Point group: D4
Chain length 121, copies 8
Amino acid sequence: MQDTIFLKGMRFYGYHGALSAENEIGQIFKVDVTLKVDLSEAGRTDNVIDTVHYGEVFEEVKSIMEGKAVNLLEHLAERIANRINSQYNRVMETKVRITKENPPIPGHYDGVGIEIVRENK
Amino acid sequence: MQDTIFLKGMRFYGYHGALSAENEIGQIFKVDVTLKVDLSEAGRTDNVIDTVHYGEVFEEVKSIMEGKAVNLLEHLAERIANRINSQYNRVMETKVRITKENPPIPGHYDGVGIEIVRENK
Amino acid sequence: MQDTIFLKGMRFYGYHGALSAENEIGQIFKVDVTLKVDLSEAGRTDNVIDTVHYGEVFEEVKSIMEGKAVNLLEHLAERIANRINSQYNRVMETKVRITKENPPIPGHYDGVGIEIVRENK
Amino acid sequence: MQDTIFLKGMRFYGYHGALSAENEIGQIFKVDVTLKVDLSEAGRTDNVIDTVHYGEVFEEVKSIMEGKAVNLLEHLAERIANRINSQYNRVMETKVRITKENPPIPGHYDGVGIEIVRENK
Amino acid sequence: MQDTIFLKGMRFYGYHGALSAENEIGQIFKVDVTLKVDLSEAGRTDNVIDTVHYGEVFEEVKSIMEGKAVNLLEHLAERIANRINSQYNRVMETKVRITKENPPIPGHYDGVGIEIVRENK
Amino acid sequence: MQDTIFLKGMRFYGYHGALSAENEIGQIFKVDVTLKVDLSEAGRTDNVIDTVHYGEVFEEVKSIMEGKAVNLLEHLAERIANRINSQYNRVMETKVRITKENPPIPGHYDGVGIEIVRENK
Amino acid sequence: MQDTIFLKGMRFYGYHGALSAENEIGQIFKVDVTLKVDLSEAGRTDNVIDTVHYGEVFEEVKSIMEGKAVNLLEHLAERIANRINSQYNRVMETKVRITKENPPIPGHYDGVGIEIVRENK
Amino acid sequence: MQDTIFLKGMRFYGYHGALSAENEIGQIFKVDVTLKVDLSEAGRTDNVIDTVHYGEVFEEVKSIMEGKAVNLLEHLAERIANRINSQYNRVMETKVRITKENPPIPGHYDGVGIEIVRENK
Ligand SMILES: CCOC(=O)c1cnc(N)nc1O
Ligand SMILES: CCOC(=O)c1cnc(N)nc1O
Ligand SMILES: CCOC(=O)c1cnc(N)nc1O
Ligand SMILES: CCOC(=O)c1cnc(N)nc1O
Ligand SMILES: CCOC(=O)c1cnc(N)nc1O
Ligand SMILES: CCOC(=O)c1cnc(N)nc1O
Ligand SMILES: CCOC(=O)c1cnc(N)nc1O
Ligand SMILES: CCOC(=O)c1cnc(N)nc1O
């Protein structure tokens, strides 16, 4: 099964970061979410009740990104991946990629980040 | 076999959407189509009759995207995937990705959408 | 083995095309080439003689793209893939993607094209 | 395991190159690094000590890119891949892609380069 | 007075062109329209009746761009500039820029075109 | 005097619009602000007290963009221009450009909008 | 009179440059040409004979850019500006901007260059 | 006289900023420099000695951007504008634009900054 629902380039301004000054000033976090969900039924029925609504998924990402400040991007992605899977049974697997295009790193780069893939148990 | 014919960034203005106001105002839908087709013969013969003409494929996508308003992107992709496979035997598999870069979701994101992969039976 | 040498976004102005007017006016063709080549030796020795020089590969693509006008993109890719493999033994496999970002198709799209993968026998 | 930490679009100005004039004038080198690292622990603990800090990884890439001039991009990638793996046990595999968007090649292209994948033994 | 209403990056697929083959195959035309209109009243009243509605202006551009095939971009811009001014008194001046990003010119360029500025008499 | 302080590409999600459905669903509004302010003193003294702090200016734009829903972009720009000038004496003139890159207009365009220039009396 | 005909983002690979190694290896030169030409007649008549054909202008730029190697960008622009004006009476003024997005300068920048404006005497 | 020499998109990582944490972590500063310089002589002679070499100008910007940390962007631009004019007589006027695409401002914007124009006395 290779069907997916996606949310790309989601951006939030938070204060997460392993550096004290990071959490003090904050920055923009770019988030990419890809869910593994069978869309044949919804494709045939045309009923949003037979799929996973993205608007709702965006709410879950937002609430986590713009919530309490944590240290690692790994923790935010793990909280997002765990939150989506717990709420949606149709999501067989969740993949979260978070990017800090402007971290406290003296250099020239397009961005840094992490990406995790979490199956729905 | 890893050969493919593709149509990327196709854009249509339609009125599909699970919200009444969506179908009232409409928006731009971005569509990506990738077909699994062996191109050795056409590669050797140079005869467009030995491959699948994209211009025609674009017609099938257009007619569906700019046709009656449905509810889900899943339904549009399913109608496109089913329509291409029914018409072309050389297409061993069809993959449709539809993106709503500007849905009724209060946030900042590059876009949301779905992607399905349908084999040709 | 997942090492590769690549040439991306190569652009040539040619007159290939299944339409008579296409070959009359011409257009820009964008080409992407990816070769499967083991780079450990060259990585250790630092000797360009232990790898496949891209400058030369670009010559082979250019000569084919800016050569006689054929009909299908499939034929150009097949001529490129066959030409690279015949000349380089270190290339275990060749992948050619050609894009016509502006074909004779009345619509809005980022481009259309094909992609082939040819192993080196 | 599909988790990864990444550094994209890193750019350095060096004098590497198989041509004498290349090393004389120099140019910009774009580098992409992707590490295979399990992030569950760090995802649960939120402790940067349970993951691989990118800032440090960027230091290793920088020191190599802006260090002595070598001949091949293959040598730089091999030195980077070998250096990251030797220092971090949590990195199960390292992938380095280096791009010369402006080499001594008379043509129009977005760039040329190589990419290697090195497992951590 | 430096207030303006604008429509940028409007794109239409037409068959205009000084070459017979151009009008046969067609291409995409990008259009930029900038109108000189005092927006204080509308800025104070908030009444769309005190300004020039862009949706309507887009209709006038569309009808002309996707209408009969002419020869010069100069003629299309002149027809657009003359049509907007005749219909709207609040438009003190009209500026039309049309771009053919892909004309029958064997070369590499971002595009070619013209731009005219027509006062409303 | 040609000195300026600027805020470019500011984006807010609001519900302004001359159409009932517009205000119901909302959309993203892109805002560009350019202030005419002499920066010699601040350039010599290095004292943020001798210039106009952008962070504060962004607050004024935000509060207006994400405030009550009005009808015209002209009204939002007029409220922004009037609000900045009233608060800052050093701003000799304010210029506001607002863009609706995705309005209720069935077509292909990069965006539509307005731009006003208001001197500080 | 504010009418203009333009050629943007023209790119040529040449060997011009004040450094010996520059002329040895070469690089891409980006050229922007803007001509001041009254387009009312051509706008009314629709006769390409009443305007300045860009295809021809592109030929003049190309022949100069891809011709003998000079030292300064100033010399190339001066040769282009002088060549266009000498050939076309309808061009009341010529403006040439040349950019070296990748010169022999150790740093990070989008590009460097010059721009000249030459009236037609 | 409308001739100019330019340096666009220059980027440096510094620690300037009115906030203590800003100077602690640092960020990327984008700089645009435009000099008013007559290029006819250099255009005729082709002698780099008859113009202002950009490589040198880039050195002056770099040394200032990557030098001691100041508070305001206004101070950096004023130091750059004053430094260029003092060293080059042919520069009749200097214009410096500095952008902080990622300041300590909780929002979504492409960037903020200032721009000054300083004549050479
Ligand atoms: C300096 C702040 O660093 C981080 O937040 C961080 C570093 N490395 C990794 N892997 N994750 C992080 O969140
Ligand atoms: C509010 C409209 O929503 C949709 O159209 C929609 C939502 N979720 C999914 N998965 N598909 C849709 O088409
Ligand atoms: C109208 C010209 O069409 C083509 O050249 C063409 C169409 N389809 C495919 N698959 N390849 C082509 O080259
Ligand atoms: C002319 C310089 O060429 C190179 O540096 C080079 C060429 N080919 C490959 N595969 N690697 C290189 O580094
Ligand atoms: C070959 C087609 O050319 C044109 O259409 C054309 C050329 N030059 C100018 N100035 N305008 C045109 O429309
Ligand atoms: C359909 C909504 O239209 C508008 O909001 C609108 C139209 N025209 C102008 N000039 N301004 C607007 O805000
Ligand atoms: C090192 C090569 O430099 C140049 O070619 C050059 C430098 N400065 C100016 N103003 N023009 C040039 O062409
Ligand atoms: C919070 C840091 O702010 C600044 O550095 C700053 C603010 N406003 C202006 N006009 N210039 C600055 O440098």
